Amino acid sequence: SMLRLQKRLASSVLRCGKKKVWLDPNETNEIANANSRQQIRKLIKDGLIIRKPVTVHSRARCRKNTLARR
Amino acid sequence: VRYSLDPENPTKSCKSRGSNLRVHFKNTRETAQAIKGMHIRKATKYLKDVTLKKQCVPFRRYNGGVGRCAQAKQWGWTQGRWPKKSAEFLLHMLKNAESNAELKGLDVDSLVIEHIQVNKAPKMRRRTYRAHGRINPYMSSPCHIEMILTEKE
């Protein structure tokens, strides 16, 4: 149904933006009836709310280039 | 209520009315004229073909501007379109008329449309914004639709 409220609440609790918040696409009915920051923590512990890992930005190419610079 | 022309044989006739329908009058009138003399089942499949862009509605009176289509030749006309929501609205009206015939207790498979009429409803205004701080109306063109079906052999 509607999950904007849950996504905003999950982002606020997780201290990260809604970009990295992963809501379970299977248990949408379970997620949709949370509507409270206290029980989304229960959902987080259950694992239905997971923060996606940070996008990789490796400096290995930069370090290899700087080795030739040195 | 009071219709335009009463059926000649009210015993075996069904009626349907729709007032203040948000659909273009010019499209509705010309898609009504095509199905004016059709059978009930033939009209319904014709409307479905119009919705699926398989059969076209020839634009005869409100003909200015609308381009040509290959399907118009079967109507003896050079211009046609496929107004889907106009077809859907009177398709619902045809279904409502069929329900009325079922309620009255008539043979559905023998219904031929005789009278169908489209009139202009009171326009409802909206606002559009033009250059130099000018305001012009954005009038809609709703229509009234009236239909009567009578059994035929």
Added chain:
Amino acid sequence: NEVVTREYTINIHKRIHGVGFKKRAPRALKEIRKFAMKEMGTPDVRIDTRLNKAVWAKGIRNVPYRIRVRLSRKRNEDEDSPNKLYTLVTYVPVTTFKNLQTVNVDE
């Protein structure tokens, strides 16, 4: 007889030759669906997400020229649409599209 599964290869390059850069990939999806509907008499065609990822692997303006697709006509589930059966398209990771006939797989 009707519940069948068969895999082909689609020449996306041939089927989208001449389309704009910002329209290649979306039209490639349309042509894949059109090809499935053309070769199997079923307007209901569903494209798997893995196939969607494979087509959009490079970009909107860059698509693989040939792609291997497993096309399966399956009996429809509940929520009865007018189409009594549906078609499913699955990507087939293949190293080389050479001397590959349109083989018919079996259960």
Added chain:
Amino acid sequence: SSHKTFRIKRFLAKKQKQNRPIPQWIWMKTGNKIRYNSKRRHWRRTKLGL
């Protein structure tokens, strides 16, 4: 403005309370011609002045 004065805030308070719709039981009166509240105010059409 978040630094509202007391008088302005009180004036806004009255306008907000005036902006509510007419109750549905009034138009059942005998000598009634009020089909709707014609003096409703919207924050995007009328700016209330001030």
Added chain:
RNA sequence: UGGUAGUAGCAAAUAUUCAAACGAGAACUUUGAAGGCCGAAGUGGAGAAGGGUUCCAUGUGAACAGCAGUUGAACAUGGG
């Protein structure tokens, strides 16, 4: 209230695709995946002036959001 006329147009800022869910109805809502943009003088996060309930939740889809909308800064209820 007509002809114009179902006409002009709905072309400033690269771009969407797939599957599912609610739903009677989905190019437009939500989720998940992919492909993108803003590229830290931002399409980010917070203020002053200004606006004054537009902030939050539920319900409706009568009217408006120049298509549509299951969406809204729309409407009705209660909070803050």
